[PDB]
Amino acid sequence: IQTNYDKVVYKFDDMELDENLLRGVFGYGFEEPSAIQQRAIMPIIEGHDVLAQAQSGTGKTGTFSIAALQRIDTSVKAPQALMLAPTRELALQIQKVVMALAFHMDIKVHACIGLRDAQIVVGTPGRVFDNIQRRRFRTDKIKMFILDEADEMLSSGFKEQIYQIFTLLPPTTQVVLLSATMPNDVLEVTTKFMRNPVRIL
Protein backbone atom coordinates (compact mmCIF):
# COMPACT_ATOMS: atom_id res chain seq x y z
CA ILE A 1 0.00 0.00 0.00
CA GLN A 2 1.49 3.28 -1.22
CA THR A 3 -0.22 6.57 -0.44
CA ASN A 4 0.43 10.33 -0.15
CA TYR A 5 -2.39 10.70 2.43
CA ASP A 6 -1.65 9.31 5.90
CA LYS A 7 -4.96 9.18 7.77
CA VAL A 8 -5.96 5.56 8.47
CA VAL A 9 -9.37 4.91 10.07
CA TYR A 10 -10.09 1.43 11.45
CA LYS A 11 -13.77 1.65 12.38
CA PHE A 12 -16.70 3.07 10.42
CA ASP A 13 -17.72 4.53 13.80
CA ASP A 14 -14.63 6.72 13.58
CA MET A 15 -15.39 8.22 10.16
CA GLU A 16 -18.06 10.51 11.68
CA LEU A 17 -20.68 9.33 9.18
CA ASP A 18 -24.34 10.32 9.36
CA GLU A 19 -26.02 7.82 11.70
CA ASN A 20 -28.69 6.89 9.17
CA LEU A 21 -25.87 6.10 6.77
CA LEU A 22 -23.93 4.23 9.45
CA ARG A 23 -27.08 2.23 10.13
CA GLY A 24 -27.15 1.23 6.47
CA VAL A 25 -23.45 0.31 6.40
CA PHE A 26 -23.71 -2.09 9.35
CA GLY A 27 -27.11 -3.15 8.08
CA TYR A 28 -25.51 -4.17 4.80
CA GLY A 29 -23.01 -6.49 6.43
CA PHE A 30 -20.03 -4.13 6.44
CA GLU A 31 -18.33 -4.87 9.74
CA GLU A 32 -14.71 -3.74 9.43
CA PRO A 33 -13.37 -1.29 6.88
CA SER A 34 -11.04 -2.95 4.37
CA ALA A 35 -7.49 -1.77 3.65
CA ILE A 36 -8.82 0.53 0.91
CA GLN A 37 -11.83 1.88 2.83
CA GLN A 38 -9.50 2.46 5.78
CA ARG A 39 -7.68 5.01 3.68
CA ALA A 40 -9.89 6.27 0.84
CA ILE A 41 -13.29 7.07 2.31
CA MET A 42 -12.12 10.02 4.40
CA PRO A 43 -10.23 11.93 1.67
CA ILE A 44 -13.20 11.54 -0.67
CA ILE A 45 -15.54 12.94 1.99
CA GLU A 46 -13.08 15.81 2.55
CA GLY A 47 -13.32 16.86 -1.08
CA HIS A 48 -9.98 15.75 -2.47
CA ASP A 49 -9.70 14.49 -6.03
CA VAL A 50 -8.78 10.84 -5.45
CA LEU A 51 -6.86 8.31 -7.52
CA ALA A 52 -7.03 4.75 -6.20
CA GLN A 53 -5.58 1.63 -7.79
CA ALA A 54 -7.62 -1.14 -6.25
CA GLN A 55 -8.23 -4.71 -7.33
CA SER A 56 -11.83 -5.88 -7.54
CA GLY A 57 -13.32 -7.46 -4.44
CA THR A 58 -11.26 -5.19 -2.17
CA GLY A 59 -14.27 -3.05 -1.28
CA LYS A 60 -14.13 -0.40 -4.04
CA THR A 61 -17.88 0.02 -4.45
CA GLY A 62 -18.39 0.52 -0.73
CA THR A 63 -15.58 3.09 -0.60
CA PHE A 64 -17.07 5.56 -3.07
CA SER A 65 -20.68 4.66 -2.24
CA ILE A 66 -20.31 5.48 1.46
CA ALA A 67 -18.36 8.68 0.76
CA ALA A 68 -20.82 9.83 -1.89
CA LEU A 69 -23.83 9.18 0.38
CA GLN A 70 -22.22 11.16 3.20
CA ARG A 71 -21.83 14.09 0.80
CA ILE A 72 -25.39 14.20 -0.51
CA ASP A 73 -27.53 17.22 0.47
CA THR A 74 -30.81 15.30 0.69
CA SER A 75 -32.76 18.55 0.55
CA VAL A 76 -31.53 19.11 -3.04
CA LYS A 77 -33.55 16.94 -5.45
CA ALA A 78 -31.16 16.87 -8.44
CA PRO A 79 -28.02 14.95 -9.48
CA GLN A 80 -25.13 15.55 -7.06
CA ALA A 81 -23.00 12.47 -7.77
CA LEU A 82 -22.44 10.88 -11.17
CA MET A 83 -21.00 7.37 -11.20
CA LEU A 84 -19.67 5.83 -14.42
CA ALA A 85 -19.11 2.06 -14.85
CA PRO A 86 -17.83 0.20 -17.94
CA THR A 87 -20.84 -2.15 -18.21
CA ARG A 88 -24.57 -2.23 -17.50
CA GLU A 89 -24.03 -5.10 -15.05
CA LEU A 90 -21.48 -3.23 -13.01
CA ALA A 91 -23.71 -0.15 -13.08
CA LEU A 92 -26.68 -2.18 -11.91
CA GLN A 93 -24.62 -3.66 -9.11
CA ILE A 94 -23.44 -0.23 -7.93
CA GLN A 95 -27.08 0.86 -7.83
CA LYS A 96 -27.92 -2.19 -5.69
CA VAL A 97 -25.23 -1.34 -3.14
CA VAL A 98 -25.97 2.41 -3.03
CA MET A 99 -29.65 1.75 -2.41
CA ALA A 100 -28.89 -0.76 0.34
CA LEU A 101 -26.57 1.68 2.11
CA ALA A 102 -29.14 4.45 1.72
CA PHE A 103 -31.90 2.28 3.19
CA HIS A 104 -32.40 4.58 6.15
CA MET A 105 -32.02 7.71 4.07
CA ASP A 106 -34.25 9.63 1.70
CA ILE A 107 -32.06 9.40 -1.40
CA LYS A 108 -33.05 8.74 -4.99
CA VAL A 109 -30.62 6.64 -7.08
CA HIS A 110 -31.23 6.12 -10.79
CA ALA A 111 -29.38 3.98 -13.32
CA CYS A 112 -28.74 5.17 -16.91
CA ILE A 113 -28.65 2.00 -19.00
CA GLY A 114 -36.94 9.66 -13.33
CA LEU A 115 -33.49 11.09 -13.99
CA ARG A 116 -34.54 14.70 -13.31
CA ASP A 117 -34.60 14.58 -9.50
CA ALA A 118 -32.35 11.58 -8.82
CA GLN A 119 -29.58 12.61 -6.44
CA ILE A 120 -27.23 9.86 -7.52
CA VAL A 121 -26.99 8.82 -11.16
CA VAL A 122 -25.20 5.62 -12.18
CA GLY A 123 -24.56 4.55 -15.75
CA THR A 124 -22.40 3.74 -18.73
CA PRO A 125 -20.50 6.56 -20.52
CA GLY A 126 -22.48 6.39 -23.75
CA ARG A 127 -25.92 6.36 -22.16
CA VAL A 128 -25.04 9.10 -19.68
CA PHE A 129 -23.54 11.33 -22.34
CA ASP A 130 -26.60 10.88 -24.54
CA ASN A 131 -28.96 11.80 -21.69
CA ILE A 132 -26.90 14.88 -20.97
CA GLN A 133 -27.04 15.89 -24.63
CA ARG A 134 -30.82 15.48 -24.73
CA ARG A 135 -30.97 17.29 -21.39
CA ARG A 136 -32.68 14.45 -19.52
CA PHE A 137 -30.93 15.72 -16.40
CA ARG A 138 -29.07 18.88 -15.37
CA THR A 139 -25.42 18.78 -14.36
CA ASP A 140 -25.18 22.07 -12.46
CA LYS A 141 -25.59 20.49 -9.03
CA ILE A 142 -23.09 17.69 -9.64
CA LYS A 143 -20.41 17.81 -6.95
CA MET A 144 -18.81 14.38 -7.43
CA PHE A 145 -17.70 12.53 -10.57
CA ILE A 146 -16.76 8.88 -9.95
CA LEU A 147 -15.12 6.68 -12.60
CA ASP A 148 -15.23 3.07 -11.51
CA GLU A 149 -12.80 0.77 -13.33
CA ALA A 150 -11.29 3.59 -15.35
CA ASP A 151 -8.79 1.30 -17.10
CA GLU A 152 -11.75 -0.79 -18.36
CA MET A 153 -13.65 2.22 -19.68
CA LEU A 154 -10.80 3.95 -21.48
CA SER A 155 -9.90 0.67 -23.19
CA SER A 156 -13.45 0.19 -24.47
CA GLY A 157 -13.36 3.38 -26.49
CA PHE A 158 -15.22 5.54 -24.00
CA LYS A 159 -12.27 7.90 -23.64
CA GLU A 160 -13.82 10.60 -25.82
CA GLN A 161 -17.26 10.43 -24.22
CA ILE A 162 -15.64 10.77 -20.80
CA TYR A 163 -13.54 13.77 -21.84
CA GLN A 164 -16.71 15.41 -23.09
CA ILE A 165 -18.71 14.67 -19.99
CA PHE A 166 -15.86 16.23 -17.95
CA THR A 167 -16.13 19.50 -19.87
CA LEU A 168 -19.93 19.54 -19.39
CA LEU A 169 -19.63 19.32 -15.59
CA PRO A 170 -19.05 22.21 -13.19
CA PRO A 171 -15.38 23.24 -13.16
CA THR A 172 -15.43 22.58 -9.43
CA THR A 173 -16.42 18.90 -9.57
CA GLN A 174 -14.49 16.50 -7.38
CA VAL A 175 -13.07 13.60 -9.39
CA VAL A 176 -12.69 10.08 -8.04
CA LEU A 177 -11.05 7.53 -10.26
CA LEU A 178 -10.71 3.83 -9.36
CA SER A 179 -8.73 1.44 -11.52
CA ALA A 180 -7.16 -1.98 -11.03
CA THR A 181 -4.31 -1.26 -13.46
CA MET A 182 -2.46 1.95 -14.25
CA PRO A 183 -2.30 2.15 -18.08
CA ASN A 184 -0.56 5.27 -19.41
CA ASP A 185 -4.06 6.27 -20.47
CA VAL A 186 -5.32 6.27 -16.90
CA LEU A 187 -2.43 8.46 -15.74
CA GLU A 188 -3.32 10.79 -18.57
CA VAL A 189 -6.91 11.41 -17.50
CA THR A 190 -5.51 11.87 -14.01
CA THR A 191 -3.11 14.63 -14.97
CA LYS A 192 -5.75 16.32 -17.12
CA PHE A 193 -8.73 16.38 -14.73
CA MET A 194 -7.38 16.06 -11.21
CA ARG A 195 -5.81 18.76 -9.08
CA ASN A 196 -3.14 17.66 -6.59
CA PRO A 197 -4.94 14.33 -6.15
CA VAL A 198 -4.68 12.00 -3.19
CA ARG A 199 -2.97 8.85 -4.49
CA ILE A 200 -3.58 5.43 -2.94
CA LEU A 201 -1.75 2.58 -4.66
Short mmCIF file of N, CA and C in Angstrom, two decimals, residues 15-109:
data_model
loop_
_atom_site.label_atom_id
_atom_site.label_comp_id
_atom_site.label_asym_id
_atom_site.label_seq_id
_atom_site.Cartn_x
_atom_site.Cartn_y
_atom_site.Cartn_z
N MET A 15 -15.34 7.34 11.32
CA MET A 15 -15.39 8.22 10.16
C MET A 15 -16.39 9.37 10.29
N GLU A 16 -17.07 9.46 11.44
CA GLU A 16 -18.06 10.51 11.68
C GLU A 16 -19.18 10.59 10.63
N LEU A 17 -19.63 9.42 10.18
CA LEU A 17 -20.68 9.33 9.18
C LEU A 17 -22.05 9.63 9.78
N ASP A 18 -22.98 10.04 8.93
CA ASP A 18 -24.34 10.32 9.36
C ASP A 18 -24.81 9.00 9.97
N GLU A 19 -25.57 9.05 11.06
CA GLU A 19 -26.02 7.82 11.70
C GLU A 19 -26.95 6.98 10.83
N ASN A 20 -27.79 7.63 10.04
CA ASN A 20 -28.69 6.89 9.17
C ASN A 20 -27.88 6.15 8.12
N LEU A 21 -26.75 6.74 7.74
CA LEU A 21 -25.87 6.10 6.77
C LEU A 21 -25.20 4.95 7.49
N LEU A 22 -24.63 5.24 8.65
CA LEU A 22 -23.93 4.23 9.45
C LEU A 22 -24.83 3.02 9.67
N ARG A 23 -26.10 3.29 9.93
CA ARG A 23 -27.08 2.23 10.13
C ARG A 23 -27.09 1.34 8.89
N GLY A 24 -27.14 1.97 7.72
CA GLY A 24 -27.15 1.23 6.47
C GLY A 24 -25.89 0.42 6.22
N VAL A 25 -24.74 0.99 6.58
CA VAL A 25 -23.45 0.31 6.40
C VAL A 25 -23.47 -1.01 7.15
N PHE A 26 -23.67 -0.92 8.47
CA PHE A 26 -23.71 -2.09 9.35
C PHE A 26 -24.86 -3.00 8.93
N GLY A 27 -25.96 -2.38 8.51
CA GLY A 27 -27.11 -3.15 8.08
C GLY A 27 -26.81 -3.94 6.82
N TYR A 28 -25.85 -3.48 6.04
CA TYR A 28 -25.51 -4.17 4.80
C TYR A 28 -24.61 -5.37 5.02
N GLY A 29 -23.91 -5.39 6.14
CA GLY A 29 -23.01 -6.49 6.43
C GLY A 29 -21.57 -6.04 6.50
N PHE A 30 -21.36 -4.73 6.37
CA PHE A 30 -20.03 -4.13 6.44
C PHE A 30 -19.67 -4.03 7.91
N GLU A 31 -18.74 -4.86 8.35
CA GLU A 31 -18.33 -4.87 9.74
C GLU A 31 -17.07 -4.04 10.00
N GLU A 32 -16.00 -4.40 9.30
CA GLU A 32 -14.71 -3.74 9.43
C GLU A 32 -14.27 -3.13 8.12
N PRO A 33 -13.80 -1.87 8.15
CA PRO A 33 -13.37 -1.29 6.88
C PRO A 33 -12.17 -2.04 6.32
N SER A 34 -12.15 -2.25 5.01
CA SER A 34 -11.04 -2.95 4.37
C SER A 34 -9.85 -2.00 4.24
N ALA A 35 -8.71 -2.55 3.83
CA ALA A 35 -7.49 -1.77 3.65
C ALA A 35 -7.79 -0.47 2.90
N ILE A 36 -8.46 -0.60 1.76
CA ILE A 36 -8.82 0.53 0.91
C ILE A 36 -9.78 1.53 1.55
N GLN A 37 -10.84 1.02 2.18
CA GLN A 37 -11.83 1.88 2.83
C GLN A 37 -11.23 2.55 4.06
N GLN A 38 -10.19 1.92 4.61
CA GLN A 38 -9.50 2.46 5.78
C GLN A 38 -8.76 3.73 5.41
N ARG A 39 -8.44 3.87 4.13
CA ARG A 39 -7.68 5.01 3.68
C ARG A 39 -8.35 5.97 2.71
N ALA A 40 -9.25 5.45 1.87
CA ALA A 40 -9.89 6.27 0.84
C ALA A 40 -11.21 6.96 1.13
N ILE A 41 -12.02 6.42 2.04
CA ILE A 41 -13.29 7.07 2.31
C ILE A 41 -13.14 8.50 2.80
N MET A 42 -12.31 8.69 3.83
CA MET A 42 -12.12 10.02 4.40
C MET A 42 -11.70 11.11 3.41
N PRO A 43 -10.63 10.88 2.62
CA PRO A 43 -10.23 11.93 1.67
C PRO A 43 -11.32 12.27 0.66
N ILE A 44 -12.11 11.28 0.26
CA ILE A 44 -13.20 11.54 -0.67
C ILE A 44 -14.23 12.44 0.03
N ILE A 45 -14.58 12.12 1.26
CA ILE A 45 -15.54 12.94 1.99
C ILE A 45 -15.00 14.39 2.13
N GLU A 46 -13.70 14.51 2.38
CA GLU A 46 -13.08 15.81 2.55
C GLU A 46 -12.96 16.64 1.29
N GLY A 47 -13.34 16.08 0.15
CA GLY A 47 -13.32 16.86 -1.08
C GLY A 47 -12.13 16.74 -2.00
N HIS A 48 -11.16 15.92 -1.64
CA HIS A 48 -9.98 15.75 -2.47
C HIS A 48 -10.30 14.97 -3.74
N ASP A 49 -9.56 15.25 -4.80
CA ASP A 49 -9.70 14.49 -6.03
C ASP A 49 -8.95 13.24 -5.57
N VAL A 50 -9.43 12.06 -5.92
CA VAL A 50 -8.78 10.84 -5.45
C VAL A 50 -8.52 9.81 -6.54
N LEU A 51 -7.27 9.34 -6.58
CA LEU A 51 -6.86 8.31 -7.52
C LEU A 51 -6.56 7.07 -6.67
N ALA A 52 -7.23 5.97 -6.97
CA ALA A 52 -7.03 4.75 -6.20
C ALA A 52 -6.91 3.51 -7.08
N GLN A 53 -5.75 2.86 -7.02
CA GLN A 53 -5.58 1.63 -7.79
C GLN A 53 -5.98 0.52 -6.85
N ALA A 54 -7.13 -0.08 -7.11
CA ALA A 54 -7.62 -1.14 -6.25
C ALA A 54 -8.19 -2.30 -7.04
N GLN A 55 -7.76 -3.50 -6.67
CA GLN A 55 -8.23 -4.71 -7.33
C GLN A 55 -9.68 -4.92 -6.96
N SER A 56 -10.42 -5.62 -7.81
CA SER A 56 -11.83 -5.88 -7.54
C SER A 56 -11.96 -6.77 -6.30
N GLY A 57 -13.10 -6.66 -5.63
CA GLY A 57 -13.32 -7.46 -4.44
C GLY A 57 -12.62 -6.93 -3.20
N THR A 58 -11.96 -5.78 -3.31
CA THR A 58 -11.26 -5.19 -2.17
C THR A 58 -12.11 -4.14 -1.45
N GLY A 59 -13.37 -4.02 -1.88
CA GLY A 59 -14.27 -3.05 -1.28
C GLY A 59 -14.30 -1.69 -1.96
N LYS A 60 -14.11 -1.65 -3.28
CA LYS A 60 -14.13 -0.40 -4.04
C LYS A 60 -15.51 0.25 -4.04
N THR A 61 -16.53 -0.51 -4.39
CA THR A 61 -17.88 0.02 -4.45
C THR A 61 -18.29 0.68 -3.14
N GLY A 62 -18.03 -0.01 -2.03
CA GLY A 62 -18.39 0.52 -0.73
C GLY A 62 -17.65 1.81 -0.41
N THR A 63 -16.39 1.89 -0.84
CA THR A 63 -15.58 3.09 -0.60
C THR A 63 -16.21 4.36 -1.19
N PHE A 64 -16.49 4.37 -2.49
CA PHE A 64 -17.07 5.56 -3.07
C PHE A 64 -18.56 5.71 -2.81
N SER A 65 -19.25 4.60 -2.52
CA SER A 65 -20.68 4.66 -2.24
C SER A 65 -20.94 5.33 -0.90
N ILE A 66 -20.18 4.92 0.11
CA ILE A 66 -20.31 5.48 1.46
C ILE A 66 -19.92 6.96 1.45
N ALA A 67 -18.80 7.29 0.81
CA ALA A 67 -18.36 8.68 0.76
C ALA A 67 -19.33 9.55 -0.01
N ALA A 68 -19.87 9.04 -1.12
CA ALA A 68 -20.82 9.83 -1.89
C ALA A 68 -22.11 10.08 -1.10
N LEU A 69 -22.60 9.05 -0.40
CA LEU A 69 -23.83 9.18 0.38
C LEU A 69 -23.68 10.17 1.52
N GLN A 70 -22.49 10.21 2.12
CA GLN A 70 -22.22 11.16 3.20
C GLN A 70 -22.22 12.60 2.69
N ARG A 71 -21.91 12.77 1.41
CA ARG A 71 -21.83 14.09 0.80
C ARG A 71 -23.12 14.60 0.15
N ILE A 72 -24.14 13.77 0.10
CA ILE A 72 -25.39 14.20 -0.51
C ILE A 72 -26.18 15.18 0.38
N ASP A 73 -26.69 16.25 -0.23
CA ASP A 73 -27.53 17.22 0.47
C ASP A 73 -28.91 16.70 0.11
N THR A 74 -29.50 15.90 0.98
CA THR A 74 -30.81 15.30 0.69
C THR A 74 -31.95 16.29 0.47
N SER A 75 -31.72 17.56 0.78
CA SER A 75 -32.76 18.55 0.55
C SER A 75 -32.82 18.83 -0.95
N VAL A 76 -31.65 18.86 -1.60
CA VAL A 76 -31.53 19.11 -3.04
C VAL A 76 -31.91 17.88 -3.89
N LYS A 77 -33.01 18.01 -4.62
CA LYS A 77 -33.55 16.94 -5.45
C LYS A 77 -33.09 17.03 -6.92
N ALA A 78 -31.79 16.83 -7.12
CA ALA A 78 -31.16 16.87 -8.44
C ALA A 78 -29.85 16.10 -8.33
N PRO A 79 -29.28 15.70 -9.48
CA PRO A 79 -28.02 14.95 -9.48
C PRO A 79 -26.87 15.66 -8.76
N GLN A 80 -26.25 14.98 -7.80
CA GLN A 80 -25.13 15.55 -7.06
C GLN A 80 -23.88 14.70 -7.25
N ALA A 81 -24.10 13.41 -7.54
CA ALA A 81 -23.00 12.47 -7.77
C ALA A 81 -23.29 11.66 -9.03
N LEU A 82 -22.32 11.61 -9.93
CA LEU A 82 -22.44 10.88 -11.17
C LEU A 82 -21.41 9.76 -11.10
N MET A 83 -21.88 8.53 -11.25
CA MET A 83 -21.00 7.37 -11.20
C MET A 83 -21.02 6.68 -12.55
N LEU A 84 -19.84 6.47 -13.12
CA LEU A 84 -19.67 5.83 -14.42
C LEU A 84 -19.01 4.44 -14.29
N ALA A 85 -19.64 3.42 -14.88
CA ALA A 85 -19.11 2.06 -14.85
C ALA A 85 -18.96 1.61 -16.31
N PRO A 86 -18.03 0.68 -16.57
CA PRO A 86 -17.83 0.20 -17.94
C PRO A 86 -18.96 -0.63 -18.55
N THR A 87 -19.75 -1.31 -17.72
CA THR A 87 -20.84 -2.15 -18.21
C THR A 87 -22.15 -1.91 -17.48
N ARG A 88 -23.24 -2.38 -18.08
CA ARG A 88 -24.57 -2.23 -17.50
C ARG A 88 -24.74 -3.11 -16.27
N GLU A 89 -23.96 -4.19 -16.19
CA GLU A 89 -24.03 -5.10 -15.05
C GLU A 89 -23.37 -4.46 -13.84
N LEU A 90 -22.20 -3.89 -14.07
CA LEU A 90 -21.48 -3.23 -13.01
C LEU A 90 -22.36 -2.10 -12.49
N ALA A 91 -22.85 -1.28 -13.42
CA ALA A 91 -23.71 -0.15 -13.08
C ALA A 91 -24.91 -0.56 -12.24
N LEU A 92 -25.52 -1.67 -12.62
CA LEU A 92 -26.68 -2.18 -11.91
C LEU A 92 -26.28 -2.59 -10.51
N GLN A 93 -25.12 -3.22 -10.40
CA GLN A 93 -24.62 -3.66 -9.11
C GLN A 93 -24.35 -2.46 -8.20
N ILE A 94 -23.73 -1.42 -8.73
CA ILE A 94 -23.44 -0.23 -7.93
C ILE A 94 -24.74 0.39 -7.42
N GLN A 95 -25.79 0.31 -8.23
CA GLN A 95 -27.08 0.86 -7.83
C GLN A 95 -27.63 0.05 -6.67
N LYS A 96 -27.45 -1.27 -6.73
CA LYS A 96 -27.92 -2.19 -5.69
C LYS A 96 -27.30 -1.81 -4.35
N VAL A 97 -25.98 -1.68 -4.34
CA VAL A 97 -25.23 -1.34 -3.14
C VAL A 97 -25.61 0.03 -2.57
N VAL A 98 -25.62 1.05 -3.43
CA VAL A 98 -25.97 2.41 -3.03
C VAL A 98 -27.35 2.46 -2.37
N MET A 99 -28.31 1.76 -2.96
CA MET A 99 -29.65 1.75 -2.41
C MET A 99 -29.69 1.05 -1.05
N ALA A 100 -28.93 -0.03 -0.92
CA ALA A 100 -28.89 -0.76 0.34
C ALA A 100 -28.29 0.12 1.44
N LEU A 101 -27.21 0.83 1.12
CA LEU A 101 -26.57 1.68 2.11
C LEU A 101 -27.45 2.86 2.49
N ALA A 102 -28.24 3.32 1.52
CA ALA A 102 -29.14 4.45 1.72
C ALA A 102 -30.51 4.05 2.26
N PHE A 103 -30.63 2.79 2.68
CA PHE A 103 -31.90 2.28 3.19
C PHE A 103 -32.58 3.15 4.23
N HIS A 104 -31.81 3.73 5.13
CA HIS A 104 -32.40 4.58 6.15
C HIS A 104 -32.31 6.04 5.79
N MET A 105 -32.11 6.33 4.51
CA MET A 105 -32.02 7.71 4.07
C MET A 105 -33.04 7.99 2.98
N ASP A 106 -33.29 9.26 2.72
CA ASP A 106 -34.25 9.63 1.70
C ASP A 106 -33.45 10.09 0.49
N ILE A 107 -32.88 9.12 -0.23
CA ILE A 107 -32.06 9.40 -1.40
C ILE A 107 -32.54 8.64 -2.62
N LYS A 108 -32.60 9.34 -3.74
CA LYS A 108 -33.05 8.74 -4.99
C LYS A 108 -31.85 8.43 -5.90
N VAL A 109 -31.70 7.15 -6.23
CA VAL A 109 -30.62 6.64 -7.08
C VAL A 109 -31.21 6.12 -8.39
#
